[PDB]
Amino acid sequence: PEWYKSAVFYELSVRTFQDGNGDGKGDFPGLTSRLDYLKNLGVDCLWLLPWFPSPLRDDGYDVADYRGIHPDLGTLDDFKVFLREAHARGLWVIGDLVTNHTSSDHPWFQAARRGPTLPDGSPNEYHDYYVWSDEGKEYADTRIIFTDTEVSNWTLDEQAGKYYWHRFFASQPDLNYDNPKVVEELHGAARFWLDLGLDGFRVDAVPYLIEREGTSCENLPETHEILKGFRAMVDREYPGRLLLAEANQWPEEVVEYFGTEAEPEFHMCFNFPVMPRLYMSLKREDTSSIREIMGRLPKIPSFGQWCIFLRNHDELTLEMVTDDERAFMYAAYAPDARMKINVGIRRRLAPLLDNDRRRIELLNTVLLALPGSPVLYYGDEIGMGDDLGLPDRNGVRTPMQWNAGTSGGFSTAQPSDCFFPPIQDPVYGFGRVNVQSQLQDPSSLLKWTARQLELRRAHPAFAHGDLTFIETGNPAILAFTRQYDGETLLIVSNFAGNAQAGLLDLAPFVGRAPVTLSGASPLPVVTGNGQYPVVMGKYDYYWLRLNS
Amino acid sequence: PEWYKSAVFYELSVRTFQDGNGDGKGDFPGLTSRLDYLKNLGVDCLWLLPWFPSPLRDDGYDVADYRGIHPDLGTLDDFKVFLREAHARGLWVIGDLVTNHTSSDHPWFQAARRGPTLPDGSPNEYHDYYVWSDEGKEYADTRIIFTDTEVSNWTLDEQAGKYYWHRFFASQPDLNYDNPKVVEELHGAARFWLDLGLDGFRVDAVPYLIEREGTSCENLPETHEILKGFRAMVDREYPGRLLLAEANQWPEEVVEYFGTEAEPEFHMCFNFPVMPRLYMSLKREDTSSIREIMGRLPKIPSFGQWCIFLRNHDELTLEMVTDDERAFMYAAYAPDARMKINVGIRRRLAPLLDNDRRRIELLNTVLLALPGSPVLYYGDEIGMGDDLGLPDRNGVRTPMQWNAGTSGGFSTAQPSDCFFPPIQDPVYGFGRVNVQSQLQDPSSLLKWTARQLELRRAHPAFAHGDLTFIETGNPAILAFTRQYDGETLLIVSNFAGNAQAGLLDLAPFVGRAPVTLSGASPLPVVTGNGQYPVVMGKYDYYWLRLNS
Amino acid sequence: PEWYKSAVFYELSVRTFQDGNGDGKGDFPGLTSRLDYLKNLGVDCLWLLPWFPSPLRDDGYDVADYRGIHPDLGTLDDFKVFLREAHARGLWVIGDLVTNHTSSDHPWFQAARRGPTLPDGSPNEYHDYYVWSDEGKEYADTRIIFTDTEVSNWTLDEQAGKYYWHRFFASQPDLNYDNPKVVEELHGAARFWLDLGLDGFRVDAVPYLIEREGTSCENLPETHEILKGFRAMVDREYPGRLLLAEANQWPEEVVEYFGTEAEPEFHMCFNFPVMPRLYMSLKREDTSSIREIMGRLPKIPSFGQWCIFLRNHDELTLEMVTDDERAFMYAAYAPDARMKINVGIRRRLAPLLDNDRRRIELLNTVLLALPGSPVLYYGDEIGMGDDLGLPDRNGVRTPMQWNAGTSGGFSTAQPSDCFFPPIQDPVYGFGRVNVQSQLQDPSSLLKWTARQLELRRAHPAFAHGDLTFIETGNPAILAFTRQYDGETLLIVSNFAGNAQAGLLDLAPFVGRAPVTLSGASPLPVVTGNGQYPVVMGKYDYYWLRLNS
Ligand SMILES: OCC1=C[C@H](N[C@H]2C[C@H](CO)[C@@H](O)[C@H](O)[C@H]2O)[C@H](O)[C@@H](O)[C@@H]1O
Numbered sequence A, B, C: 001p002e003w004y005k006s007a008v009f010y011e012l013s014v015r016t017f018q019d020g021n022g023d024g025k026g027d028f029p030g031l032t033s034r035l036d037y038l039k040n041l042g043v044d045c046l047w048l049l050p051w052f053p054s055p056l057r058d059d060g061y062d063v064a065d066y067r068g069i070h071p072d073l074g075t076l077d078d079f080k081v082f083l084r085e086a087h088a089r090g091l092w093v094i095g096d097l098v099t100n101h102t103s104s105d106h107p108w109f110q111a112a113r114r115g116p117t118l119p120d121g122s123p124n125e126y127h128d129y130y131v132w133s134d135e136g137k138e139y140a141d142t143r144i145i146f147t148d149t150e151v152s153n154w155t156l157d158e159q160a161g162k163y164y165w166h167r168f169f170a171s172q173p174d175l176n177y178d179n180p181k182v183v184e185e186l187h188g189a190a191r192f193w194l195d196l197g198l199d200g201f202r203v204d205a206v207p208y209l210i211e212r213e214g215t216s217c218e219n220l221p222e223t224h225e226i227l228k229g230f231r232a233m234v235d236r237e238y239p240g241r242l243l244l245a246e247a248n249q250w251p252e253e254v255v256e257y258f259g260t261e262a263e264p265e266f267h268m269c270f271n272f273p274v275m276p277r278l279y280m281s282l283k284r285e286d287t288s289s290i291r292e293i294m295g296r297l298p299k300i301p302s303f304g305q306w307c308i309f310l311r312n313h314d315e316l317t318l319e320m321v322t323d324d325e326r327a328f329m330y331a332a333y334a335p336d337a338r339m340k341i342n343v344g345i346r347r348r349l350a351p352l353l354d355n356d357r358r359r360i361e362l363l364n365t366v367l368l369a370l371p372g373s374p375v376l377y378y379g380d381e382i383g384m385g386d387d388l389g390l391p392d393r394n395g396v397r398t399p400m401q402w403n404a405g406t407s408g409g410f411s412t413a414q415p416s417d418c419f420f421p422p423i424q425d426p427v428y429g430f431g432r433v434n435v436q437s438q439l440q441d442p443s444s445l446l447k448w449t450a451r452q453l454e455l456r457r458a459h460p461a462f463a464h465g466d467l468t469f470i471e472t473g474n475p476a477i478l479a480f481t482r483q484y485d486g487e488t489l490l491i492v493s494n495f496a497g498n499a500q501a502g503l504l505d506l507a508p509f510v511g512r513a514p515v516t517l518s519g520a521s522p523l524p525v526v527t528g529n530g531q532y533p534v535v536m537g538k539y540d541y542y543w544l545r546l547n548s
């Protein structure tokens, strides 16, 4: 199969990973010096947060120049060396393609805001790069994403004397995909990096490209059409590259972003629908929603692969759960108002689970066992915390924690001069949570992650198999099979914090012996009616094979 | 009107309030020395927990003798002084009538377990006192109440070689109320205490008296009949005395336990329907469930009053809430499995609200301003915590905390020798939480409670007026009026942790000023459409009078 | 800008914070061991009370060696370790420079008092260090500061047979700043500590340096000139250090102590004029004094920052308020004779506000929201009380209360062996009020204070913004805006104990939507003419931003 189908992805932010020169900002040289770490961990493809020139009002997702390297990060030369050394070690690298909008500081908007027509009466060709309105009445009753900050998706520009559209911050005016010069402007952005050897893109905020009156301005067919065309371009000019979609929508609409066999869109999309149901189930001690929401995902094209994930650099999003499910999530996972933002909970994986390794390991094993390619968020493999004193979603973007030295090993700059402060609290600060500690610790979470990815490489059914759920007679116990190329894996997992009993419907497997993938230790042979009694300890995960 | 309509109740346990003599067990001489404190708090009626002789397998709710005083608590003489001194201070006292069942140790059951006929052939009249079955397949698919202890509501008696019935523990066999001799053993048990001057009874577990095949064995019309004859008795032989029912059922089944004007039952029932919705609304910042369960309550007889309460000696009960309501409450209010028992949450009021006085005060103001008569659980007026290392529901029955001396002022005996250990943790311990502390502190929870009761007493609409909810334009803001004898109170309460805006429908009251009950500070008069704009700070409660 | 404009200051006393060796006295080893506490609280600069050798007749403000460490506190090595550990955590430190006077035990004064001419007939260079009069009739009609102790500002030295000047205790003779050798001795004291890395100085009693006949001997131009020279010396030889002035004068004279842009003096002064008016307004429930006094303060130099404080190690000074205001304050806050001392009230914050956390929280938020940098008095963040059985102002200097073990955690010596006895009363004693308790209490005053500072960090308009008072129609409601960097904060505060309504004049902000800084909950958009109705609870603080 395709290479993204067997990849382990790792999300990181250059500005925040490793500082080479002491100025308190992460840079490409520093990242380059930590590629062995990543490769040794089991990671195949790096996804880098936006690295472009930017005023950084949205941490670099407000892009001022698509064909360069933000000075904080080094030079285009440093980037090219980084990418040569990543491929040297057999890693792929994808970047973040911000397509729905640019920074207000981008030259195109600096131009667009001079008005429709130029001092000499000739049309301003850049005015139609963005979306203007005289009074801002259009696209009413359209959802506001950054609700804690924006009262409107229209904002009046003082120089233009008109309103411009923005699905995100006001300093992030939306591009106009009804204008064909904009479609080409970002094909050209794509070519610039694909040409240098980048292996693909995470494509950002794709559901919000085209706005149409009388609709939600999400998932519009006019939007999908642009993505089909973006895929046809890459498919022709750069075979083998990866287009990955950030499309947090409900199951029926998400699968649309893969396109069809006849008309392909994305190769992979994040599985936003299952993510919140993992957390809900852990609290409810009941994995129904996991099974229900996955069952609502229609089959995807041949070339398609899901990207599975526990957390990332944004909040834990509650946009696409029901109202009762959202209320449950704030109650169970955000007991401080400060942990809420913009319809989601802005916390890291370990804090979200009360720093309980049994529960952390549990969800990571579901992450590695569900059908897709997993993506780890940087620092989650050592158990990093968060700093909710930082604004917006930056509390989960604090410096990587490398050792107990100055600034957690992130920089020789003082923690007060680092672009964000390395966490220093008594539970998750870098005197306790760092890579150097966990490399010497024989039983560290980091060592555990490495070992678990290793276990998964051994069994291609994780990467490529189907998924069939198994009845257990106990909602605390989720059980399913993964079949691929002759091998059958049984995954049994307890989402309860005490011992749980189950009776597994192993009818199709009578006469087979389940045996542990780790240590090749066999269980009683399935007999009789195949209803198989099991007991599990708290947050237990059973990775088993069903014999030939 | 009736005295229980204007009364403030207060629930305590003699074994646990005050130890007079130094042996570690609270007693009636000790309780007697604290009547002045209770008088000064603003309390009118003491409800005592079961004081009868007993092996204490359900803390005295397993009664071995309905006509005595448990030796722990002193003697029947000590009882008589206590009731003289309480009455001398204008206090009413009601006992706990454990009707549905007795202790296995009661001399009734020791006789009934010797078989249907005696060793000399004659028939054993005590056998039909309890409910029996040879195989114990009757009344199946009936709910277990103590789901964490009892596997079945039938248990084999080894000597009588049959099964007996028990809705509660196996040492608490149900009484057979088909047998009219049992109805008369409890009438005469009631008569014993009423003859001594006791002002009433709280009656225990009244839904579960009669059991019949093909029914749930709850609120059976037969059970109600027995209650009707109990009130008919008391109305005749002891006018003015009080019958109060513990009936945890859904709004439509609970009002039945009042009877009708023509056929009366209880004077008072505990308003269980609203109790869990108070907590949900605080966590959801959504006061909707309060208005809906209050709305499902049908009007009650003329003589009837609700008994409003936040907590008691039992768990917070999750039996009469939906499955999603129950699952939400576990998430929001029971982070540990230890905190759970028997479809409920075994935690004191202050721990339930994270010791946030602003929240504690809010639920109290709602407790004091809903229609009915409030009952305070002992020690919640100084903010006692709990001890969840103690079995069953004992963790909310730890000794009262009077001062910072030996065992919190409860006993001269060591904490290890007290019947329950006085709490000594750094947050709720008697070094931090005690009555001497809060009589000196000008602003303690204790003095706040005494003053809020003082303020309530000044406005009889609180105890007898009607309830009209009011539209606020914000699920977080609960607003209602109370109307009685020409007074109109307006009770606005924020259930959200941040500031909240609201538009109150004061259309009926255009032209009238609202003014504070405390301080006589008037707000702007209501005008025009009477949509009254209001802002509220976190957890704010506005007690206001609408001028005339 | 400069670091002290963003700093949160914290005032502590080494002898009283933490004893690191069991001898009952705080020391620098002990204070070093508590630095993570201050860091995690959100403190940036530690103002340490006088740490010099001294007989402690005024608790170390009678200095006897400006270049050493009082043996109670440890050695100069201990001081160096403390400064290294403070800076290693991003904490600045400043000392208390006692410029106006030395101890009578100071070597200089033991020398000066020998007479103008030594036994060998040669002159005594140290006689002219202090201020001498032959009959003590100069500067008559000049205020006595320590009115409860000192009957005159001239006292007869037994040995010199002349009169020496002292604005303070007779054991604190005033230094004579007309002698330029004196001026050099305190530039030299400054240099010593400024050379070890200390970040600056709180400068004690700076109005009273120079005395002149026919004046008040306050705020004289000759005193300001010496202070300009002190600023010049630091500006040149130690750039970036902080000079903070203690000048309790009337609003006009206070501002002089900043100097001018051309001839600079102090970087910061305490905002003494506003401090009493905060208390006046809380008792009157009328905030006009807060506005009248704030508005008599002229604009300050570019480098100027105000230091805001509620209480400190002194008495609550009533020196700079009218006779009627002072009589009110005595009536409202000094019921017992014992509570007055020298034109002022000697009580801690929490006793002053009757331990009402609502009122403690209100004034703390005004402290954090007025223009300036805030300074917290140690132990006030946990609600410490006072011991008015101690003499002078020591009642507010009792040891920090850390846990509920021996002496409250301050020392392993018994309370009766501690320099001052740690409080043990039922309301404020370390058994009820201590750090460890309040770290476990999910709702403690300590956590509140930490979180409120974090709220403040997030909005630079608090440190840096301007201030426009806003009409409300209700004197009980104090409303103002803070504008900086185009972020606009609206801060509304109720100073009364019941609900209050008002009409905010928000005309400059029509079309803006106010949202809570905590939670982002929106109030209605300002419409119409910006007359915005609000209702507030008792002692409510609305902390709002005006979303643009
Ligand atoms: O709807 C799902 C999401 C999409 C959005 N995430 C992406 C789009 C935004 C584009 O500027 C950006 O802030 C964010 O980091 C990106 O990863 C949003 O900001 C998230 O908070 C949210 O969970």
Ligand SMILES: OCC1=C[C@H](N[C@H]2C[C@H](CO)[C@@H](O)[C@H](O)[C@H]2O)[C@H](O)[C@@H](O)[C@@H]1O
Pocket: B058, B061, B062, B168, B172, B204, B205, B246, B247, B248, B313, B314, B315, B316, B317, B319, B342
């Ligand atoms: O359904 C309401 C309830 C009734 C039951 N409460 C009473 C019945 C039990 C009788 O022995 C007794 O333990 C309990 O204290 C009484 O107040 C039960 O134990 C509670 O858990 C529960 O909230």
Ligand SMILES: OCC1=C[C@H](N[C@H]2C[C@H](CO)[C@@H](O)[C@H](O)[C@H]2O)[C@H](O)[C@@H](O)[C@@H]1O
Pocket: C058, C061, C062, C145, C168, C172, C204, C205, C246, C248, C313, C314, C315, C316, C317, C319
């Ligand atoms: O007028 C303001 C004040 C200054 C003075 N405070 C300082 C000067 C004194 C110098 O010896 C000292 O006692 C006090 O602690 C210092 O902080 C005075 O003692 C206070 O009572 C008073 O509030």
Ligand SMILES: [Ca+2]
Pocket: A100, A174, A175, A176, A177, A208, A209, A210, A211
């Ligand atoms: Ca768009």
Ligand SMILES: [Ca+2]
Pocket: B100, B174, B175, B208, B209, B210, B211
């Ligand atoms: Ca029964």
Ligand SMILES: [Ca+2]
Pocket: C100, C174, C175, C176, C208, C209, C210, C211
């Ligand atoms: Ca002087």
Ligand SMILES: [Mg+2]
Pocket: A019, A020, A021, A022, A023, A024, A025, A026, A027, A072, A073
């Ligand atoms: Mg760098």
Ligand SMILES: [Mg+2]
Pocket: B019, B020, B021, B022, B023, B024, B025, B026, B027, B072
């Ligand atoms: Mg006793």
Ligand SMILES: [Mg+2]
Pocket: C019, C020, C021, C022, C023, C024, C025, C026, C027, C072
């Ligand atoms: Mg010491």
